[PDB]
Design a protein around this ligand. Structure first.
Ligand SMILES: *[C@@H]1O[C@H](CO)[C@@H](O[C@@H]2O[C@H](CO)[C@@H](O[C@@H]3O[C@H](CO)[C@@H](O)[C@H](O[C@H]4O[C@H](CO)[C@@H](O)[C@H](O)[C@@H]4O)[C@@H]3O)[C@H](O)[C@H]2NC(C)=O)[C@H](O)[C@H]1NC(C)=O
Ligand SMILES: *[C@@H]1O[C@H](CO)[C@@H](O[C@@H]2O[C@H](CO)[C@@H](O[C@@H]3O[C@H](CO)[C@@H](O)[C@H](O[C@H]4O[C@H](CO)[C@@H](O)[C@H](O)[C@@H]4O)[C@@H]3O)[C@H](O)[C@H]2NC(C)=O)[C@H](O)[C@H]1NC(C)=O
Ligand SMILES: *[C@@H]1O[C@H](CO)[C@@H](O[C@@H]2O[C@H](CO)[C@@H](O[C@@H]3O[C@H](CO[C@H]4O[C@H](CO)[C@@H](O)[C@H](O)[C@@H]4O)[C@@H](O)[C@H](O)[C@@H]3O)[C@H](O)[C@H]2NC(C)=O)[C@H](O)[C@H]1NC(C)=O
Ligand SMILES: *[C@@H]1O[C@H](CO)[C@@H](O[C@@H]2O[C@H](CO)[C@@H](O[C@@H]3O[C@H](CO[C@H]4O[C@H](CO)[C@@H](O)[C@H](O)[C@@H]4O)[C@@H](O)[C@H](O)[C@@H]3O)[C@H](O)[C@H]2NC(C)=O)[C@H](O)[C@H]1NC(C)=O
Ligand SMILES: *[C@@H]1O[C@H](CO[C@@H]2O[C@H](CO)[C@@H](O[C@@H]3O[C@H](CO)[C@@H](O)[C@H](O[C@H]4O[C@H](CO)[C@@H](O)[C@H](O)[C@@H]4O)[C@@H]3O)[C@H](O)[C@H]2NC(C)=O)[C@@H](O)[C@H](O)[C@H]1NC(C)=O
Ligand SMILES: *[C@@H]1O[C@H](CO)[C@@H](O[C@@H]2O[C@H](CO)[C@@H](O[C@@H]3O[C@H](CO)[C@@H](O)[C@H](O)[C@@H]3O)[C@H](O)[C@H]2NC(C)=O)[C@H](O)[C@H]1NC(C)=O
Ligand SMILES: *[C@@H]1O[C@H](CO)[C@@H](O[C@@H]2O[C@H](CO)[C@@H](O[C@@H]3O[C@H](CO)[C@@H](O)[C@H](O)[C@@H]3O)[C@H](O)[C@H]2NC(C)=O)[C@H](O)[C@H]1NC(C)=O
Ligand SMILES: *[C@@H]1O[C@H](CO[C@@H]2O[C@H](CO)[C@@H](O[C@@H]3O[C@H](CO)[C@@H](O)[C@H](O)[C@@H]3O)[C@H](O)[C@H]2NC(C)=O)[C@@H](O)[C@H](O)[C@H]1NC(C)=O
Ligand SMILES: *[C@@H]1O[C@H](CO)[C@@H](O[C@@H]2O[C@H](CO)[C@@H](O)[C@H](O)[C@H]2NC(C)=O)[C@H](O)[C@H]1NC(C)=O
Ligand SMILES: *[C@@H]1O[C@H](CO)[C@@H](O[C@@H]2O[C@H](CO)[C@@H](O)[C@H](O)[C@H]2NC(C)=O)[C@H](O)[C@H]1NC(C)=O
Ligand SMILES: *[C@@H]1O[C@H](CO)[C@@H](O)[C@H](O)[C@H]1NC(C)=O
Ligand SMILES: *[C@@H]1O[C@H](CO)[C@@H](O)[C@H](O)[C@H]1NC(C)=O
Ligand SMILES: *[C@@H]1O[C@H](CO)[C@@H](O)[C@H](O)[C@H]1NC(C)=O
Ligand SMILES: *[C@@H]1O[C@H](CO)[C@@H](O)[C@H](O)[C@H]1NC(C)=O
Lengths: 603, 235, 232
């Protein structure tokens, strides 16, 4: 006799069932051996079934620290109609005491109870069988154990007062969590996690030593529904008033409502609150009078993280509700959404006015800034933007400098982020300064002198008739379009060869400028090598066939000759036999052609 | 995004990728031996410190940067066209300077700039390159995506998208029924239209209303009017 | 409809832990926290993430789509600092022992233990399942990772109304988005190749002014070493 993996045989060895169905409170073996105490080695106490009206059970290694990880679970069953009331004495342990209590057996074991790091207290379950499971969080010697007792009583003799009156000092008292929602409540002692939401103290006791219930503090990012149900209430000749305290702290609190369901299915809402009321316990008071049995359901809608809702001090009295000593709760005011567009401020920044000051530079500038400064100067002047202190966030807010004087602006540079920034020099007399910022986490800002004059930022022109590159260096004779290198920018080698009297972008007569004089070239010793040399000087591709037309240039044409060092020889001498100007044509460079090894599949 | 297709290796050597902080943020096109052409919207505020931009030329697979055909490079100088305004959404063209130079190993080649007196009738299929996604809000594909869209005139673009002024300096493209677009997902890069012998830089991928939406053409930078500006950083 | 933006702006969000192999996720049926892979058999995360059952996911790229590079490891051991108060978030740090040795690859790797605490201005990488969009009313499936500098200790302490202890410091802001990316209640915060924060808490969902609070593990490196030695 063998069983499939993941399954265990019974005592009779007649069939194989899943191991998870053993010692769960539900009979699965044909002979009922799955519920036997001997088979279910509790180890913690040595007994598994507690069918009497009273008894006790103990955890593993109660008097001394334990060094063994053994899963323990207990099942307590009583006669139908009796409610089992649990009791605990010692649970002050540094976790490692995860206790799971579930109402009934089967699919009802989802989110009934999960208690650790606190005293469970008196817990009552309105079912014939109670499933208690003890799970060890770790095998480290940092836990002691516990021993608990139980008792049974008639659950239907309870009046409307006992079914509702509960300070949550010991669990839910006589309340049963809902099952039609996603996630249920849990027991929390003292302040909760996730600051700025959830209660920080218990209302009944007044400080952290108290016991209450609230929505789970798990840092989830999904919307969940939490509901609580009440026992049926017998009809009464006098209306009853419901007193309860509700805590609604959190920016994501959606809605807390109460639904009353009777045998007539006339569901109605008498209590409903929305929004955030701060860290204050708010008193609730409703009046209910039903001629038939009815139940009180607490409906809580939980949004993503920071949407905690708490309930405490629920009780039921008799007669019409009296004057509520605690007034209606006050909602936390929202930030004013009144015109967050922009502030405007100093629209114009010109004249001999002093340094810009927004009166809030040390602290912060208004969010969603779109203001402009408009730096203006006299005709013929420029604008210099020398920054004093610069401090911005990551790349979402920018500072724009524009020099177009109109809608056709000329963007110069963009500055953002912390650290010093370079000065900005404009080309015109009007500089447009734009500050575009986000709606969150404004920085200090920036300040500037905006002092300028005549031709500031432009390097002084070179003297002695020396050529000036982009860097302002002197190029008298050596690097005048002769394949040398003087300035770092490389502008000293600007193209001094261009087509003249041409027709297309690559067809035209040869025009050369050695130093400062434009002139053509002769055709005395022209060859293919000279053709490709001029192509390189013209920034084109391979040479193409060319045909002379007529010697129309009577000026000092330059004679081109080849040299062994690879440098073209330029002789500005009027020495040529049967001169004829060449209409040179050069092919285009290697453009975006698919010259790679590209092939297609012939299928 | 849906609409593109996987591109063969070496089919588009001029399409290169731009990385800022290790993430694929923008795409550029080679036009010379030391300069690139990319959209100016992706350099909006990241040019103050030209040291975090890494240009990957010849990139075809994001998760692979070790082939000899791919030569990683750093960008030390980024320039923005002064006519960029970010409000008129016009002249959104920028250029980046390579470290020292670039080679030509049959997988890193320069794009052909538009010439003078060039005619581009609408309706012709111009190829679009870029690393698109699988949905409107997906992630960039590990394989370069290629697609073809018909050219659209500036007259109909304003009617299709009244929210944008478009203006004659921008040329739109897209389908009447949509379904193929590259407005979202990445910067896109260059817009390419073929002419038998020389793949011309038909445009630079720019902003757009929304991808695959009918009557919502994608906006591209008109390089034909930017030829003189581009022809200022060539060896 | 232009929900996020009408231009090709993505905010520089990391492409599913690209070049960030020191991010792990904790699962208990849904994503609730995260941490940093300190070594091949241990992770570091904030102590407020304690749960009955925790599943550690290493190298997770998408919440729903699995790329085959994700390793699922159960929480064999869960140990928190003995001085961690349930009411006060001081010493907000916990260690979870992986039941199996981590697999080192291009998207899963360990992080070097810090030897000196940074003062200010140090670049930090914070990974968390935030909002990778400018606006909307949906939860994106992408994984958010934004760089962040280090603020001065005095400013971080003074910003909060006395809610900052000697083991807390401000690192990340994570502005923009629908309702910001928050701090994801955990996740790696590595500065200059050293894990400095584990994301403790913050004033709301990083609305403004005070975006979040991070726990400095430089004061708990000794405790981490002691726990590793005790549990091998
Ligand atoms: C646990 O205790 C509860 C105590 O409530 C018990 O439930 C029932 O309680 C009621 C009231 O205490 C008992 O009396 C009944 O009340 C109902 C109310 O509607 C009446 O309808 C019943 O009428 C019967 O008797 C009349 C003569 O007086 C007859 O004319 C009529 O036809 C009915 O036969 C009755 O007065 C009720 O007896 C108990 N239920 C039982 C079964 O005794 C509950 O039963 C207790 N739990 C267990 C497991 O015993
Ligand atoms: C607590 O009890 C209250 C009742 O006091 C209950 O309130 C319900 O609110 C909804 C509005 O949110 C009411 O309107 C319904 O809204 C749904 C939304 O989809 C509609 O589909 C419903 O229409 C149905 O019925 C129509 C015929 O009347 C059909 O033509 C239609 O196709 C739908 O089938 C409906 O208009 C609703 O009436 C009340 N009452 C209910 C649902 O009994 C609240 O939901 C309860 N809360 C809890 C937690 O139990
Ligand atoms: C809870 O208690 C409430 C009050 O105790 C209940 O309210 C009852 O609501 C019903 C309607 O469903 C009312 O019935 C109406 O009564 C009026 C009264 O008109 C007469 O008024 C005086 C009374 O002496 C008489 O002299 C006049 O000549 C009128 O004839 C009728 O006109 C209507 O037709 C209708 O019958 C009840 O009156 C009202 N109760 C009281 C005390 O007023 C409520 O139903 C209870 N339950 C719930 C769930 O709330
Ligand atoms: C640097 O620029 C600042 C602007 O950002 C200068 O502050 C003042 O800003 C206002 C804003 O509009 C300018 O506009 C003027 O406002 C005055 C207000 O005068 C009031 O009082 C007179 C009586 O003296 C009364 O007759 C008026 O009705 C007003 O009730 C107007 O009179 C002007 O017509 C004009 O609208 C100011 O020009 C500007 N300068 C001032 C008030 O001196 C700041 O002053 C500048 N810095 C320096 C050193 O001048
Ligand atoms: C937070 O607040 C708590 C609250 O202080 C404790 O309050 C409880 C009840 O509110 C006190 O319990 C009772 O106190 C009375 C008066 O001293 C005492 O007579 C009671 O004894 C009866 O019951 C016991 C069984 O419990 C029985 O054996 C006796 O014979 C008698 O019949 C009962 O103890 C409790 O005494 C208060 N605590 C103290 C020290 O007085 C504080 O305790 C916490 O310190 C506060 N702070 C924190 C951080 O928790
Ligand atoms: C582009 O790539 C090449 C190689 O990948 C870079 O180096 C250049 O390589 C060529 C080889 O074809 C060199 O030419 C040869 O150099 C050897 C050196 O001993 C010489 O003996 C040969 O006669 C021939 O000249 C070339 O010199 C070399 N470049 C330099 C500067 O030395 C090149 O740098 C890359 N970049 C470019 C071309 O911009
Ligand atoms: C340029 O691209 C456009 C768009 O891709 C091409 O036009 C249309 O392309 C679609 C393909 O999605 C064609 O649809 C197909 O049509 C055939 C019938 O011709 C049908 O049997 C298929 O099931 C499919 O629906 C569509 O016909 C085509 N329209 C036209 C007018 O050609 C266009 O062809 C491309 N240009 C060139 C030169 O290829
Ligand atoms: C706006 O400009 C402010 C100008 O800075 C001033 O520059 C002069 C230069 O002539 C400094 O004078 C010098 O003083 C030295 C002694 O400290 C002499 O040895 C030297 O020869 C020269 O005379 C002057 O000290 C300096 N500061 C002041 C306060 O005048 C600049 O200070 C602001 O920061 C700037 N604001 C911006 C950029 O936002
Ligand atoms: C020089 O240019 C001319 C065109 O101006 C070339 O002539 C044609 O070139 C094309 C290449 O695109 C060939 O397909 C044709 O067969 C050529 N001839 C004609 C009549 O069209 C010529 O080949 C070029 N010279 C060189 C050496 O490349
Ligand atoms: C948006 O486009 C309209 C239409 O071209 C522009 O309005 C014209 O602008 C030109 C040049 O600025 C003027 O010469 C015309 O007089 C304007 N009106 C018309 C009817 O053509 C407008 O300037 C553009 N920009 C906006 C509206 O901000
Ligand atoms: C648990 O055992 C201890 C013995 O140390 C005893 O004092 C206590 O009363 C027991 N608990 C219950 C509920 O009987
Ligand atoms: C309301 O006031 C009456 C006045 O005597 C009092 O008897 C009753 O206890 C109070 N509370 C109620 C009815 O809940
Ligand atoms: C170029 O053309 C003009 C007009 O056609 C003519 O006057 C001029 O002489 C030509 N240039 C040369 C060098 O012949
Ligand atoms: C990466 O893989 C691709 C797949 O074909 C290959 O072509 C390439 O050479 C590899 N290396 C790179 C891109 O560095």
């Amino acid at each position: 006799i063998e069983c499939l993996p993941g399954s265990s045989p019974c005592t009779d060895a007649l069939t194989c069932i899943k191991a998870d169905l053993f010692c769960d409170g539900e009979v699965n073996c044909p002979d009922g051996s799955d519920e036997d105490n001997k088979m279910c080695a509790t180890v913690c106490d040595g007994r598994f079934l507690l069918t009497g009206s009273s008894g006790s059970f103990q955890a593993t290694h109660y008097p001394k620290p334990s060094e063994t990880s053994v899963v323990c679970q207990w099942i307590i069953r009583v006669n139908q109609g009796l409610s089992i009331k649990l009791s605990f004495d010692d649970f002050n342990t540094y976790y490692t005491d995860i206790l799971d209590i579930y109402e009934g057996v089967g699919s009802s074991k989802i989110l009934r109870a999960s208690i650790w790091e606190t005293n469970p207290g008196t817990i009552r379950i309105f079912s014939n069988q109670v499933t208690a499971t003890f799970l060890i969080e770790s095998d480290e010697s940092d836990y002691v154990g516990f021993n608990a007792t139980y008792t049974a009583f008639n659950s239907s003799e309870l009046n409307n007062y006992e079914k509702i009156n509960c300070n949550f000092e010991d669990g839910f008292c006589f309340w049963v969590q809902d099952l039609n929602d996603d996630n249920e409540w849990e027991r929390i002692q003292g302040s909760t996690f996730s600051p700025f939401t959830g209660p920080n103290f218990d209302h009944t006791f007044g400080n952290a030593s108290g016991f209450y219930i609230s929505t789970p503090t798990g840092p989830g990012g999904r919307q969940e529904r939490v509901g609580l149900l009440s026992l049926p209430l017998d009809p009464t000749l006098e209306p009853a008033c419901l007193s309860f305290w509700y805590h609604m702290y959190g920016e994501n609190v959606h809605k807390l409502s109460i639904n009353i369901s009777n045998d007539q299915n006339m569901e109605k809402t008498v209590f409903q609150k929305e929004g955030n009321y701060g860290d204050n316990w708010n008193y609730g008071q409703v009046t209910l009078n039903e001629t038939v049995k009815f139940k009180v359901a607490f409906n809580a809608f939980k949004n993503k993280i920071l949407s905690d809702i708490a309930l405490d001090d629920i009780s039921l009295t008799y007669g019409i509700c009296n004057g509520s000593l605690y007034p209606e709760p006050t909602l936390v005011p929202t930030p004013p959404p009144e015109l967050p567009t922009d502030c405007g401020g100093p629209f114009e920044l010109w004249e001999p006015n002093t340094t810009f000051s927004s009166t809030n530079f040390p602290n912060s500038y208004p969010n969603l800034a779109f203001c402009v400064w408009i730096l203006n100067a006299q005709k013929g002047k420029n604008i210099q933007l020398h920054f004093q202190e610069f401090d911005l966030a990551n790349i979402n807010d920018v500072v724009e400098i524009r020099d177009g004087e109109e809608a056709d602006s000329l963007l110069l540079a963009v500055y953002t982020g912390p650290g010093p920034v370079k000065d900005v020099f404009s080309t015109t007399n009007r500089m447009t300064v734009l500050l575009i910022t986000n709606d969150v986490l404004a920085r200090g800002g920036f300040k500037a002198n905006f002092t300028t004059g005549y031709h500031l930022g432009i390097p002084e022109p070179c003297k002695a008739d020396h050529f000036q590159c982009k860097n302002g260096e002197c190029v008298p004779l050596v690097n005048l379009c002769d394949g040398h290198l003087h300035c770092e920018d490389g502008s000293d080698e600007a193209d001094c060869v261009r087509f003249f009297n041409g027709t297309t972008n690559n067809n035209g007569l040869v025009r050369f400028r050695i130093q400062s004089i434009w002139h053509t070239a002769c055709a005395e010793n022209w060859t293919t090598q000279i053709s490709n040399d001029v192509c390189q000087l013209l920034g084109l591709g391979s040479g193409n066939s060319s045909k002379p037309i007529f010697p129309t240039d009577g000026g000092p044409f330059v004679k081109l000759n080849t040299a062994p060092d690879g440098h073209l020889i330029l002789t500005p001498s009027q020495q040529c036999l049967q001169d004829s100007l060449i209409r040179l044509q050069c092919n285009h460079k290697s453009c975006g052609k698919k010259l790679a090894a590209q092939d297609i599949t012939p299928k | 995004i849906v609409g593109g297709s996987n591109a063969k290796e070496g089919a588009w050597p001029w399409v290169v990728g731009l990385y800022y902080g290790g993430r694929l943020l923008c795409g550029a096109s080679l036009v010379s031996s030391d300069w690139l052409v990319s959209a100016a919207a992706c350099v909006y505020g990241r040019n103050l410190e030209p040291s975090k931009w890494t240009a990957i030329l010849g990139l075809h697979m994001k998760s692979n940067l070790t082939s000899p055909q791919t030569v990683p490079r750093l960008i030390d100088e980024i320039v923005i066209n002064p006519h960029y305004n970010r409000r008129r959404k016009d002249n959104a063209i920028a250029m980046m300077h390579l470290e020292f130079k670039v080679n030509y190993t049959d997988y890193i080649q320069p794009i052909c700039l538009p010439e003078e007196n060039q005619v581009f009738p609408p309706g012709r299929n111009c190829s679009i390159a870029g690393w698109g996604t699988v949905v409107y809000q997906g992630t960039t594909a590990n394989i370069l995506q290629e697609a073809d869209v018909p050219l659209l005139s500036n007259e109909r673009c304003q009617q299709q998208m009244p929210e944008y002024n478009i203006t004659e300096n921008m040329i739109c493209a897209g389908y009447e029924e949509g379904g193929i677009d590259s407005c979202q997902g990445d910067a896109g890069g260059p817009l390419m239209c073929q002419e038998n012998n020389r793949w011309f830089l038909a445009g630079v991928t720019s902003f757009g209303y929304k991808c695959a939406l009918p009557n919502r053409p994608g906006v591209y930078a008109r390089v034909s009017r930017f030829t003189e500006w581009i022809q200022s950083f060539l060896h | 409809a232009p929900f996020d933006d009408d231009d090709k702006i993505v905010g520089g969000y990391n492409c599913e832990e690209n070049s960030v192999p020191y991010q792990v996720s904790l699962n208990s049926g849904y994503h609730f926290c995260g941490g940093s892979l300190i070594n091949e058999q241990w992770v570091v995360s904030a102590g407020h993430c304690y749960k009955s059952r925790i599943q550690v996911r290493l190298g997770e790229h998408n919440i729903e789509v699995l790329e085959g590079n994700e390793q699922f490891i159960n929480a064999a051991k869960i140990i928190r600092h003995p001085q961690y108060d349930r009411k006060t978030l001081n010493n907000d740090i916990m260690l979870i022992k992986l039941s199996s040795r981590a697999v080192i690859n291009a998207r899963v790797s360990t992080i070097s233990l810090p030897t000196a605490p940074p003062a200010t201005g140090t670049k930090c990488l914070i990974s968390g399942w935030g909002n990778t969009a400018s606006s909307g009313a949906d939860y994106p499936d992408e994984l958010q990772c934004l760089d962040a500098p280090v603020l001065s200790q005095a400013k971080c302490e003074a910003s909060y109304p006395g809610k900052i202890t000697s083991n807390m410091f401000c690192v990340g802001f994570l502005e923009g988005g629908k309702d910001s990316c928050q701090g994801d209640s955990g996740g790696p915060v590595v500065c200059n190749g050293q894990l400095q924060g584990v994301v403790s808490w913050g004033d709301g969902c990083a609305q403004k002014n005070k975006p979040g609070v991070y726990t400095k593990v430089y004061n708990y490196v000794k405790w981490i070493k002691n726990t590793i030695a005790a549990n091998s």
